[PDB]
Amino acid sequence: GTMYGVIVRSEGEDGKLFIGTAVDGKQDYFPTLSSRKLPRDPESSAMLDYELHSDFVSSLIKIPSDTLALVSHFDIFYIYGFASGGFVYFLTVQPETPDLFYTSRIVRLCKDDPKFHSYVSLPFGCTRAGVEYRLLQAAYLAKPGEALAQAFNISSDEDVLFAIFSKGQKQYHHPPDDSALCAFPIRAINLQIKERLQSCYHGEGNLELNWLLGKDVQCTKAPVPIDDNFCGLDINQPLGGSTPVEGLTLYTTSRDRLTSV
Amino acid sequence: GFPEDSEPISITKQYPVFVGHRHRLDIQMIMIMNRTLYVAARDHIYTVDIDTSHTEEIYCSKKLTWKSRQADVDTCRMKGKHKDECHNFIKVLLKKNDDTLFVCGTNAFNPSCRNYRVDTLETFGDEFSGMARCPYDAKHANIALFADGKLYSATVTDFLAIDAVIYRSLGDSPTLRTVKHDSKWLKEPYFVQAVDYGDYIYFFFREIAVEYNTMGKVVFPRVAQVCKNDMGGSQRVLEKQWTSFLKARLNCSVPGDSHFYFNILQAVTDVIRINGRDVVLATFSTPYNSIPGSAVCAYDMLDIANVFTGRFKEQKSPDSTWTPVPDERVPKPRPGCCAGSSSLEKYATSNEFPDDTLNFIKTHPLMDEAVPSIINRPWFLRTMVRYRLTKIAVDNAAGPYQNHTVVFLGSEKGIILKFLARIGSSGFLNGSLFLEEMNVYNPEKCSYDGVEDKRIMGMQLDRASGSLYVAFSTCVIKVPLGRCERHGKCKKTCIASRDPYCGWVRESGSCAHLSPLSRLTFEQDIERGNTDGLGDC
Amino acid sequence: GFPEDSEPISITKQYPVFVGHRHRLDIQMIMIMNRTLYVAARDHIYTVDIDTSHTEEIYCSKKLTWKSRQADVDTCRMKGKHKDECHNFIKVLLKKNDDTLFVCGTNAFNPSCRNYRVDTLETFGDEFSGMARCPYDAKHANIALFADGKLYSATVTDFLAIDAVIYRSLGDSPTLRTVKHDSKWLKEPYFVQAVDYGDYIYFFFREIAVEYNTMGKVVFPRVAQVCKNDMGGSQRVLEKQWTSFLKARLNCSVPGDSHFYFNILQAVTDVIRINGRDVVLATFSTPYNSIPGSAVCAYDMLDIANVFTGRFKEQKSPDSTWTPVPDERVPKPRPGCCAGSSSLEKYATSNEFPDDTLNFIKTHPLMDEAVPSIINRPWFLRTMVRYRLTKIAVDNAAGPYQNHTVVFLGSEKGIILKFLARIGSSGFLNGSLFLEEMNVYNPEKCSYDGVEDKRIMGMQLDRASGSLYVAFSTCVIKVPLGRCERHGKCKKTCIASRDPYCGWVRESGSCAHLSPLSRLTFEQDIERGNTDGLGDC
Ligand SMILES: *[C@@H]1O[C@H](CO)[C@@H](O[C@@H]2O[C@H](CO)[C@@H](O[C@@H]3O[C@H](CO[C@H]4O[C@H](CO[C@H]5O[C@H](CO)[C@@H](O)[C@H](O)[C@@H]5O)[C@@H](O)[C@H](O[C@H]5O[C@H](CO)[C@@H](O)[C@H](O)[C@@H]5O)[C@@H]4O)[C@@H](O)[C@H](O[C@H]4O[C@H](CO)[C@@H](O)[C@H](O)[C@@H]4O)[C@@H]3O)[C@H](O)[C@H]2NC(C)=O)[C@H](O)[C@H]1NC(C)=O
Ligand SMILES: *[C@@H]1O[C@H](CO)[C@@H](O[C@@H]2O[C@H](CO)[C@@H](O)[C@H](O)[C@H]2NC(C)=O)[C@H](O)[C@H]1NC(C)=O
Ligand SMILES: *[C@@H]1O[C@H](CO)[C@@H](O[C@@H]2O[C@H](CO)[C@@H](O)[C@H](O)[C@H]2NC(C)=O)[C@H](O)[C@H]1NC(C)=O
Ligand SMILES: *[C@@H]1O[C@H](CO)[C@@H](O)[C@H](O)[C@H]1NC(C)=O
Ligand SMILES: *[C@@H]1O[C@H](CO)[C@@H](O)[C@H](O)[C@H]1NC(C)=O
Ligand SMILES: *[C@@H]1O[C@H](CO)[C@@H](O)[C@H](O)[C@H]1NC(C)=O
Ligand SMILES: *[C@@H]1O[C@H](CO)[C@@H](O)[C@H](O)[C@H]1NC(C)=O
């Protein structure tokens, strides 16, 4: 439960494996998240080579040494990932840069982006009755209810991610019992991102992704339209945010802990 | 109690000037190869044939043109950069051999590198990447050095300029970088200069100091070494990354009960010989937000080497202070000792280094000592000026017998400062001597577009032509080393100027400079500067 | 980028001068009680009756004489001190009540304290010790303060001046010292001033900083509190030693990406009211070995208090950096909270404090925060002067309506600087306004022995007399607050001077100062300083 993968073979190309995993402090040995080649010819030696590998630009993201020093046993656990429309999504739990503060996230990449410039990461969770739940324990993509479709103003085509969460942001390794099922329509994620990108491209705010950037980087104001599916440039990336994507709670309990969905 | 700003011995500008011949030139650097002055600028490289009788205006001998593709400008502008920022500015210009120039440019924030014919300046071959070879921004400072046919470079890899690196590429040798996002290695550095000397290359930069960040952010000047024979680590540690990177703080200060440091390194020279020592000269200054001062400190290349043989630093608890390392825990072979030396000839290539050595030099790039200056203080100070001191040019054989060394200092308001490196009674090196101060900038020839940028950006002394070339972003100026007829027929102060370029010749009865026709009686006092009993003006 | 040294609004000395009436006076400090100016000096205290029509020379009203016994001089000289060092210099002069003056002196490096008659200045009673009440050396700075009939003092206990202390003696209350040879408490301090305000006394000194000694030796300005009701610790901890001593770094800097601090505190005023705030004003300067600058920073007495309610500092491993203290480990009752307050009225005397509290405040005298200045920067800067700024005198009710505040600054070369505390549009405090610069030292009246010591050593403003008294070691000078007839009949710049002491009166047709006969038309613009459309000179 620290690794997840999505195989994306959109038509025309050999297709690829998008994979994220825990790397237990070996920031040199294994990338935290990468896209590998999963080629047609089964015989091929191309198997699990990085989709791109120059000296600098590569289809991989490595946890910097700076962050692994500044936070003790720093890692990123990947719980779920999915193919949706033009994008790949990964759901990640990690300790947080300065008790034990953990933060569940949504990671989004374009299916066709080797430079990994499309990267954008926002925290997610859901809250009901004053209590808040921010420790992702499971997730699962599916079609929306009829009820749920009217709720989110999505078609009965579009995807909804159903997730489970624990109370607060304390001890992921030794979790409590207060757990909560909630639904996130992809359209909401795709739009909450679209507006995050939007503002940041008008000089507004910061990149706000300190585990990978290791410092503060100011959003660059640029005349670039953030069309409905925009796939990053070499500016304003990787993109973060500290403005949770709130999901609609569906059910809670504190007698029993919830594990799967 | 802090030494007063001293006065020049002697007390304007109508020298030759080069303007291209009208647009801005945006000169980025000057250089001299063989007998031609190169002027690397925007969209161009201009040359001047130095020897072609330097006339009223200096005229463009041969030319070069490399503009940015219209496509490349579009993407640039689109990323939210300015109109004048998106051009091809030449930031790298290196002589590979007798036939090849190696030129890179910003190329509107899309750096790329070409090879050019030394003769006609026509391009040839495919263009390769300018990543980590040349800056994206025209304004950033960069290190470009050819040594052993390999390109040692230091700048940024990305448009955003987050990721700074010291990089070695080309020359059939595998490619080496400094560890990415590791501030133990590089923390937001500003690269000033690098030089070739021994089995090592020495980069001079400045960074946010990790030792003294105990309180706020502090900047330190640094000197770092790399082994020319570096081949990268094993398979477990530092593969494709330097195995000989050690850095050390430089010490440029006026000592007191508490010493006042100069940290903002502006310029380092190439290695020079002064008093039978291999030395470099660096200018520094106070942080931008502080009372303005500048110093010039000199460094013996042996002492630089000596610091890398000393003790390393380490930070025990992630919150504890920086303690020296007891030699008991330094492993063998010595971290940062070249592959193939005393005892280390048992190691054929750097790939064979054990895990002990490698995992150590990855974690301890910083040396405990701080390279000390010659005479343990600045050779020159300015504390009561509005400008900082920047560019630095040296003359290690000025005077008839060629045993005096004259140092030229460039500023930001065009003011150019000239001092003589003093020899003590002991014979040892001992302070300096503020000879002359002169303003070189020409408002009527260099303030022509919306531009008046009195900042000196490149200096090149040419003893062969008997001149020093000073480059502003708008123009290049040919200043003669010694304007001796300035002091006049008044013999009293022609001698007192103590200018190694000047003296008295009795056959003419006035003050004039040294000539290759060395048969005539040339009378000068430099070491004593004797005024005693001479007719006044 | 660092704010330029600003110019005074207006552009010498023939004021009244006091010389004693010839020997050196070696004036150590001036003071004003009731309506008489006291001049504490060598072997003497001189007084001047302020109101006795201040004439050509200022004449010695009443006198005092206390020379050192010939025996005491012998031992002094014998310990290897100089002839002029071994005299009785008056360093403490305090008004105990309406009948008693309390005077101590060096007494040739054998300090001792006497009581004197307020009226005739004839001594009475037995002399007691001057140890830790008065300095041995005439040159050292010392804190002497009477509050609640107890003597709060800070100086050195020994001839060698190793052991510095903040001491409370006298007034039927047991005697309290700061822990001897403990640099956590005091590390080589220089005592500048102390003041009475609330349940606390606030000492302003500077010390060798234990936080930032991570590299070399650094000096920090400090403010420290003691509870007026301190009675010393239990039987296990801090018996006969302060139980309310906490200190904190002051913050006087110009902020940048890296901020430039002023650390060398020279003077702090008594508590004053400016814009309905209780404040103190401090002058600072750069370390002796550095480029010379001076600042004036102001401190809200509430913010000072606020810092002592914050978090403490601590050094986990004897080699680790200084981390804040999590409130989890701060014990109750609160360390350095007075005995007899909110929740701490359950403690009758400080002797009852538990071991937890006591053993803590003994180990953690230093607060994490650093008291911030008003407008978080200096109110005044000098960075392009040869002298430092020292003495400081304030006028919190200058002008007709008495809502303007004028600050006088003394230097070291006699130059006296005058600025007005500016009110913003918001109503809040906002910068300053450099009104006038004038040189007060009189070479023809104060350079009379082998002495020309242009250093201002004491300032006393006397609004009642409408004058400011400036004391050099040789003489005291009566400078009038506003010399308004200086600006002349030229109305244009009489208004532009924006001097709250000056204005225009139409009945006379010239520029003159405020008078108690406030019936006449007095026209002044201070807040706007309106020049618009007025006849020139
Ligand atoms: C899924 O999407 C739907 C559709 O986009 C969305 O429903 C809309 O929500 C928006 C935003 O909340 C509503 O916009 C507000 O409208 C306020 C005025 O609304 C009144 O007027 C509407 C127009 O009336 C004209 O047309 C009708 C024809 O139908 C005609 O009879 C009238 O005479 C008139 O000409 C009208 O449709 C509407 O009536 C419907 O909606 C109400 C509920 O509000 C319902 O009870 C009725 O049965 C009827 O179906 C209503 O009477 C307006 O004041 C308000 O403006 C403020 O806020 C905005 C934004 O902050 C500011 O710009 C502005 O300055 C004011 O401060 C606001 O614009 C819109 O009315 C809804 N549309 C409909 C059709 O209901 C859902 O929210 C989405 N669902 C979910 C779950 O998210
Ligand atoms: C070496 O340098 C020092 C300082 O620059 C010189 O010492 C000076 O000597 C002259 C006497 O001729 C004095 O007037 C100066 O005041 C001295 N300086 C100091 C700081 O005390 C020394 O003479 C130099 N030696 C030579 C040969 O130039
Ligand atoms: C409060 O202080 C600031 C700075 O001293 C003042 O801002 C200045 O405003 C004037 C306009 O009248 C400008 O000419 C200055 O250049 C401003 N200073 C800066 C640093 O930008 C402000 O006006 C002050 N308010 C009052 C009432 O005096
Ligand atoms: C720098 O040099 C001076 C004198 O040479 C010395 O006293 C000081 O300690 C040095 N500082 C460092 C950090 O090396
Ligand atoms: C240089 O050499 C000549 C003799 O060869 C001597 O007269 C002169 O003083 C020398 N100058 C210096 C600085 O040593
Ligand atoms: C001093 O004050 C400035 C601005 O008020 C602040 O930025 C800085 O961090 C402060 N430093 C300390 C040590 O309090
Ligand atoms: C002082 O008060 C008077 C009115 O009572 C007003 O005219 C003047 O502007 C005031 N000055 C300041 C600095 O507020």
The rounded distance, in Å, linking the Cα atoms of B18 and B54 is: 10
Q: Any idea what the Cα angle at residue C70 is, between residues C66 and C75, rounded to 5°? A: 115
CA dist B115 → B93, B99, B112 (Å): 10, 10, 11
Contact B80 A234 (CB under 8 A): no
* A252: Cα within 13 Å, side-chain hemisphere: 14
How remote is the CA of residue A153 from the centroid of ligand 1, in Å? 14
- Is B376 a pocket residue for ligand 4 (Cβ < 6 Å)? yes
Which strands sit side by side in the sheet containing C392-398, from one edge to the other?
Answer: C392-398, C404-410, C415-423, C429-439
b/e map of C154-184 (b: 16 or more CB within 10 Å)? bbbbeeeeeebbbbbbbeebeebbbbeeeee
The kind and range of the H/E element at C70 are helix C70-78
Residue owning the nearest CA to atom 3 of ligand 4: B255
Tell me chain C's radius of gyration from C-alpha atoms: 25
Chains B and C touch (3+ CB pairs under 8 A): yes
Q: Which ligand is nearest to the CA of B211?
A: 4
Q: Which residues, at least 6 apart from C427, have a Cβ–Cβ distance to it below 8 Å? A: C275
Torsion angle (degrees, nearest 10) of CA C472, C477, C481, C487: -110
The rounded distance, in Å, linking the Cα atoms of C529 and A198 is: 48
Contact A65 B179 (CB under 8 A): yes
The rounded distance, in Å, linking the Cα atoms of C501 and C466 is: 10
The rounded distance, in Å, linking the Cα atoms of C263 and C265 is: 6
Determine which of B79, B176, B236 to mutate to test the interface with A (most A C-beta atoms within 10 Å): B79
Residue owning the nearest CA to atom 6 of ligand 7: C401
CA dist C34 → B378, C30, C88 (Å): 56, 14, 26
How remote is the CA of residue B9 from the centroid of ligand 5, in Å? 21
* A224: Cα within 13 Å, side-chain hemisphere: 28
Which of B378, B336, B381 is CA-nearest to residue B360? B336
Looking at the DSSP bridge assignments, the partners of residue A221 are: none
Looking at the DSSP bridge assignments, the partners of residue A249 are: A182
- Is B404 a pocket residue for ligand 5 (Cβ < 6 Å)? yes
What ligand 5 atom has the least distance to the C-alpha of B403? 1
Per-residue H/E/C for B468-535: EEEEECCCEEEEECCCHHHCCCCHHHHHHCCCCCEEEECCCCEEEECCCCCCCCEECCCCCCCCCCCC
Superfamily of the domain at C1-483: YVTN repeat-like/Quinoprotein amine dehydrogenase (2.130.10.10)
Q: Is C318 on the interface with B (CB under 8 A)?
A: no
Cβ distance C124 to C115 under 8 Å?
yes
Cβ distance C252 to C297 under 8 Å?
yes
Where do the domains of chain B lie? 1-483, 484-537
B428: left (phi > 0), else alpha (psi -120 to 50), else beta? beta
The rounded distance, in Å, linking the Cα atoms of B89 and B109 is: 9
How remote is the CA of residue C401 from the centroid of ligand 7, in Å? 7
3-state secondary structure at position C491 = helix
Looking at the DSSP bridge assignments, the partners of residue B223 are: B204, B248
Q: Is A39 on the interface with B (CB under 8 A)?
A: no
Contact A56 B78 (CB under 8 A): no
Mention the CATH class of domain C484-537.
Answer: alpha beta
Q: Is B257 on the interface with C (CB under 8 A)?
A: yes
The rounded distance, in Å, linking the Cα atoms of B17 and B445 is: 7
Cβ distance C21 to C448 under 8 Å?
no
Which of C14, C22, C27 is CA-nearest to residue C57? C14
- List of chains touching B (3+ CB pairs within 8 A): A, C
Determine which of B176, B181, B240, B355 to mutate to test the interface with A (most A C-beta atoms within 10 Å): B181
Token pair in block for residue B3: 């030494």
- List of chains touching C (3+ CB pairs within 8 A): B
Q: Which residues, at least 6 apart from A249, have a Cβ–Cβ distance to it below 8 Å? A: A126, A127, A128, A133, A180, A181, A182
- Is A147 a pocket residue for ligand 1 (Cβ < 6 Å)? no
DSSP sequence for A124-144: EEEEETTEEEEEEEEEEEEPP
Tell me chain A's radius of gyration from C-alpha atoms: 18
Which of C339, C366, C367 is CA-nearest to residue C354? C339
Q: Any idea what the Cα angle at residue C303 is, between residues C140 and C244, rounded to 5°? A: 60
Which of A83, A43, A59 is CA-nearest to residue A232? A59
Q: Tell me the pairing of strands B57-58 and B17-18.
A: parallel
Where do we find the tokens 């509870």?
C227
Q: Residue A214: which of B78, B181, B318 has the nearest Cβ? A: B181
Looking at the DSSP bridge assignments, the partners of residue C201 are: C196, C226
Q: Is C530 on the interface with B (CB under 8 A)?
A: no
Which of C531, B88, C310, B76 is CA-nearest to residue A233? B76
Cβ distance B344 to B333 under 8 Å?
yes
Cβ distance A135 to A126 under 8 Å?
no
The rounded distance, in Å, linking the Cα atoms of B282 and B300 is: 11
Q: Which ligand is nearest to the CA of C429?
A: 3
Q: Name chain B contacts of A220, Cβ cutoff 8 Å.
A: 79-80, 160
3-state secondary structure at position A7 = strand
The rounded distance, in Å, linking the Cα atoms of C179 and C175 is: 13
Q: Is B316 on the interface with C (CB under 8 A)?
A: yes
Q: Gaps after which residues in chain A, C–N over 2.5 Å?
A: 98
The rounded distance, in Å, linking the Cα atoms of B217 and B262 is: 15
Q: Tell me the pairing of strands B323-324 and B219-227.
A: unpaired
Token pair in block for residue B48: 């001047």
- Is B465 a pocket residue for ligand 5 (Cβ < 6 Å)? no
Residue owning the nearest CA to atom 7 of ligand 5: B401
Contact C215 B212 (CB under 8 A): yes
Q: Tell me the pairing of strands C17-18 and C57-58.
A: parallel
Where do we find the tokens 């630095």?
B392
The rounded distance, in Å, linking the Cα atoms of C497 and C529 is: 8
Which of B281, B489, B501, B320 is CA-nearest to residue B400? B501
**DSSP letter (8 states) at residue A29:** T
The rounded distance, in Å, linking the Cα atoms of B111 and A56 is: 14
Mark out the alpha helices in B343-458 (DSSP H runs): 355-363, 443-446
Resolution in angstroms comes to 3.6
Cβ distance B392 to B281 under 8 Å?
yes
Which of B219, B274, B248, B312 is CA-nearest to residue B420? B274
Where do we find the tokens 């895990």?
B355
Token pair in block for residue C29: 């400090």
Q: Which residues, at least 6 apart from C95, have a Cβ–Cβ distance to it below 8 Å? A: C33, C101, C102, C118, C146
Q: Which ligand is nearest to the CA of C257?
A: 6
* Chain B interface, Cβ < 8 Å to A: 77-80, 131-132, 157-160, 162-163, 175, 177, 179-184, 188, 237, 318
Q: Which ligand is nearest to the CA of B380?
A: 2
3-state secondary structure at position B106 = coil
Token pair in block for residue B251: 């010490």
Burial zone of B44 (CB within 10 Å; 0-12 exposed, 13-18 middle, 19+ buried): buried
- Is B259 a pocket residue for ligand 4 (Cβ < 6 Å)? yes
The rounded distance, in Å, linking the Cα atoms of C251 and C258 is: 14
C238: left (phi > 0), else alpha (psi -120 to 50), else beta? left
Q: Which residues, at least 6 apart from B328, have a Cβ–Cβ distance to it below 8 Å? A: none
Token pair in block for residue C327: 């409130």
Q: Is C529 on the interface with B (CB under 8 A)?
A: no
The rounded distance, in Å, linking the Cα atoms of C233 and C241 is: 7
Q: For residue C84, give how far its alpha carbon lies from the nearest alpha carbon of chain B (Å).
A: 25
Cβ distance A91 to A107 under 8 Å?
yes
The kind and range of the H/E element at B297 are strand B294-300
3-state secondary structure at position B382 = strand
Cβ distance A208 to A240 under 8 Å?
yes
The rounded distance, in Å, linking the Cα atoms of B30 and B472 is: 10
Q: Which residues, at least 6 apart from C488, have a Cβ–Cβ distance to it below 8 Å? A: C494, C510, C511, C537
Q: Residue B160: which of A62, A67, A235 has the nearest Cβ? A: A235
The rounded distance, in Å, linking the Cα atoms of B473 and B441 is: 11
3-state secondary structure at position B432 = strand
The kind and range of the H/E element at C301 are helix C301-307
Residues in A 229-258 with any Cβ partner in B closer than 8 A = 233-235
Q: Which residues, at least 6 apart from A215, have a Cβ–Cβ distance to it below 8 Å? A: B162, B188
Q: Is B215 on the interface with C (CB under 8 A)?
A: yes
